Amino acid sequence: GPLGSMPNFSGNWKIIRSENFEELLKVLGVNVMLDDIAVAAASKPAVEIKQEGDTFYIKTSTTVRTTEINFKVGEEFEEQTVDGRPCKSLVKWESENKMVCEQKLLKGEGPKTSWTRELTNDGELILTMTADDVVCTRVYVRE
């Protein structure tokens, strides 16, 4: 679970709205990173989150594919674009309810990318994914 009064992200989460996902994918092209979309693109599976303070595991499972990512809020980690360019990523708490991941390619030029996850007071989980001026929002509720 979470620290103190901060909300508990642990759960099984069902998507009930999306906007601008295909648009984001087109702007990103080969700059998209699987360590983001491999637990977000597919709408059918539950997104299974396990939170232990700052430590997160995020898992999806279909009969074809199981994927799990992990990170710790506050600890830098590396992810890859689909064409193999490394990115340094860091998640921080932006607010009581919201984490923000900043991302930077290790070398060369690309779009400014980020994502956020927010557990709003109505009980929804909001994922936003950004590439320069394009913002994708996906809204989840508990299964």
UniProtKB/Swiss-Prot annotation:
Keywords: Cytoplasm, Endoplasmic reticulum, Isopeptide bond, Nucleus, Retinol-binding, Transport, Ubl conjugation, Vitamin A. GO terms for cellular component: cytoplasm; cytosol; endoplasmic reticulum; extracellular exosome; nucleoplasm; nucleus. Induction: By retinoic acid. A motif (Nuclear localization signal) lies at residues 26-36. InterPro entries: Calycin, Fatty_acid-bd, ILBP, Lipocln_cytosolic_FA-bd_dom. There is a cross-link at K107 (Glycyl lysine isopeptide (Lys-Gly) (interchain with G-Cter in SUMO)). Sumoylated in response to retinoic acid binding, sumoylation is critical for dissociation from ER and subsequent nuclear translocation. It is found in: Cytoplasm; Endoplasmic reticulum; Nucleus. Its main location: cytoplasm. GO terms for molecular function: cyclin binding; fatty acid binding; retinal binding; retinoic acid binding; retinoid binding; retinol binding. It comes from the Eukaryota. SUPFAM superfamilies: Lipocalins. GO terms for biological process: embryonic forelimb morphogenesis; epidermis development; fatty acid transport; positive regulation of collateral sprouting; regulation of DNA-templated transcription; retinoic acid metabolic process; signal transduction. All-trans-retinoate binds at R138, V139, Y140. It holds the Pfam family Lipocalin. Belongs to the calycin superfamily. Fatty-acid binding protein (FABP) family. Interacts with RXR and RARA. Interacts with importin alpha. Forms a beta-barrel structure that accommodates hydrophobic ligands in its interior. Transports retinoic acid to the nucleus. Regulates the access of retinoic acid to the nuclear retinoic acid receptors. This is Cellular retinoic acid-binding protein 2.
